[PDB]
Amino acid sequence: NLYFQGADSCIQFTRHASDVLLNLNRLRSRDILTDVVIVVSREQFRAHKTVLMACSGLFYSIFTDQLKCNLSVINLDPEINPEGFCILLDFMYTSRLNLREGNIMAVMATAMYLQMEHVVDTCRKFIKASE
Amino acid sequence: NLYFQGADSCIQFTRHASDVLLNLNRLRSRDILTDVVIVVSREQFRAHKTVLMACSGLFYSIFTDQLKCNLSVINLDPEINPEGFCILLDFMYTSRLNLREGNIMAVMATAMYLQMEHVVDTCRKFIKASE
Ligand SMILES: Cc1cc(NCc2ccccc2F)n2ncnc2n1
Ligand SMILES: Cc1cc(NCc2ccccc2F)n2ncnc2n1
């Protein structure tokens, strides 16, 4: 079955959350209802503010700010590596984190800046395994 | 661990999709970045168009329409039961479907109208078990 008896009264659908995320990523790929452009070292990434806020403490802070919530363009710190940001943006929309020896430092520094502690801790654990 | 080696190269975060959905529901509860009001028999429900489109074929069709995508208010068919709609809206944001003997017919008819076939099939299976 696609469902089960949850701990509470309700039946719960096993694949619902992952199917929603897959569909949000399909909207992103098709540029449907994207409402922000994230600029990183002149690279541009179109996304949905709600997805960014649901994954990142920095984006949650920006988009809950009365002044900043209505910005259509957000420029990140020029020190931020676009590949590191791209890997984290894909992670937000897919649950898959493409960590490689060549990108782990950029991913970790970007996750720190974006306040994604779970990703930072994961990078730290992978780095610790190599030393 | 909060992660595993996916079938592909990437590490995957087990709870990421459900955590995103939980956070989207927290935004909904706080009325943060909600961009549409769904009106059902004069009852109003604030939501995020992207979440609605990711769950419902009717909302996908409406919000991908060049004319309708920019509507802030969507009126549903007056035949639609507000409780049935509320139960399905909560399901979209939580993966939990509060089916009860007293609401199953309204939920099924609403899921048919909203084009949520997985929910319709589930209602059909529960009804079949009672006969
Ligand atoms: C605790 C919480 C956090 C959060 N977003 C920011 C965020 C998400 C994931 C990981 C780290 C992080 F800082 N949101 N968004 C809506 N409601 C929330 N409640
Ligand atoms: C196949 C698909 C469907 C869909 N939304 C509509 C929808 C969602 C869940 C269940 C039924 C349904 F009709 N979206 N949304 C973005 N990309 C999509 N791709």
Residue numbers in the entry:
A (entry chain A), B (entry chain A): -1 to 129
Quoted from the paper:
B-cell lymphoma 6 (BCL6) protein, a member of the Broad-Complex, Tramtrack and Bric-à-brac (BTB) / Pox virus and Zinc finger (POZ) family of transcription factors, plays a key role in the formation and maintenance of B-cell germinal centres. BCL6 has an N-terminal BTB domain, responsible for obligate homodimerisation; a long unstructured central region involved in interaction with the MTA3/NuRD complex; and six C-terminal C2H2-type Zinc-fingers involved in DNA binding. Disruption of the SMRT or BCOR corepressor interaction with the BCL6 BTB domain is sufficient to inhibit DLBCL cell growth. We established a robust, soakable, high-resolution BCL6 BTB domain crystal system which allowed us to elucidate the binding mode of all nine hit series and map the binding site hot spots in relation to the binding of the corepressor peptides.
In these crystals, an uncleaved N-terminal Flag-TEV tag replaced the WVIP peptide bound to site 2, stabilising the crystal packing, but leaving site 1 unoccluded. Using this crystal system, we solved crystal structures of the BCL6 BTB domain bound to 3 additional hits, increasing the success rate for the structural characterisation of validated HTS hits to 92%. As expected, in all 12 ligand-bound BCL6 structures the compound binds in site 1, which is consistent with the competition with the peptide-based probes in the LO-NMR and FP assays. Despite their low chemical similarity, the different compounds all bind to BCL6 via similar interactions, the vast majority mimicking the interactions of BCL6 with its corepressors SMRT and BCOR. Importantly, all compounds, except the cyano-trifluoromethyl pyridines 11 and 13, interact via an H-bond between an NH group and the main chain carbonyl of Met51 in BCL6 similar to the interaction formed by the Trp509 and His1426 side chains in the BCOR and SMRT corepressor peptides. Additionally, all compounds intercalate between the side chains of Tyr58 and Asn21, as observed for Ile1428 in SMRT and Val511 in BCOR. Furthermore, all compounds except 11 have a substituent that stacks against the main chain of BCL6 residues 53–55, mimicking the interactions of the side chains of His1426 and Trp509 in the SMRT and BCOR peptides.
